């Protein structure tokens, strides 16, 4: 499923992402935008280390979900990576919450550093009624 901007903003708020571990909703929106373009079925294979990024937040199989084919991987979210490809994003949000519970927080995603950090991210959530 490819979410529309405001549709996603409203869903993330209902799921309790606004201010989660200090991260505002607009930052989560910026992250989803640059990671998958708000697409829940997006996958990206990293030939360099044999891991794959799954879903709307592009969560990595090396540490967060289990796909069975990633060498020396763990499954911190205790989810099959398949769960991160559903149209319903409840599982992906629960896993995203787990990722930022680590010391790096939102910085765990390099895309956030490159395109969201120290920027005016208001635009991503503006005018959505949240």
From Swiss-Prot:
GO terms for biological process: antimicrobial humoral response; defense response to bacterium; defense response to Gram-negative bacterium; defense response to Gram-positive bacterium; inflammatory response; killing of cells of another organism. GO terms for cellular component: azurophil granule lumen; extracellular exosome; extracellular region; extracellular space; specific granule lumen; tertiary granule lumen. Disulfide bonds join 6-128, 30-116, 65-81, 77-95. The gene is LYZ. It is linked to Amyloidosis, hereditary systemic 5: A form of hereditary systemic amyloidosis, a disorder characterized by amyloid deposition in multiple tissues resulting in a wide clinical spectrum. AMYLD5 primarily affects the viscera, and the predominant clinical features are renal dysfunction of varying severity, and intra-abdominal bleeding. Inheritance is autosomal dominant. The active site is at residues 35, 53. PROSITE patterns: GLYCOSYL_HYDROL_F22_1, GLYCOSYL_HYDROL_F22_2. SUPFAM superfamilies: Lysozyme-like. Belongs to the glycosyl hydrolase 22 family. InterPro entries: Glyco_hydro_22, Glyco_hydro_22_CS, Glyco_hydro_22_lys, Lysozyme-like_dom_sf. CDD domains: LYZ_C. It is found in: Secreted. This is Lysozyme C. It catalyses: Hydrolysis of (1->4)-beta-linkages between N-acetylmuramic acid and N-acetyl-D-glucosamine residues in a peptidoglycan and between N-acetyl-D-glucosamine residues in chitodextrins.
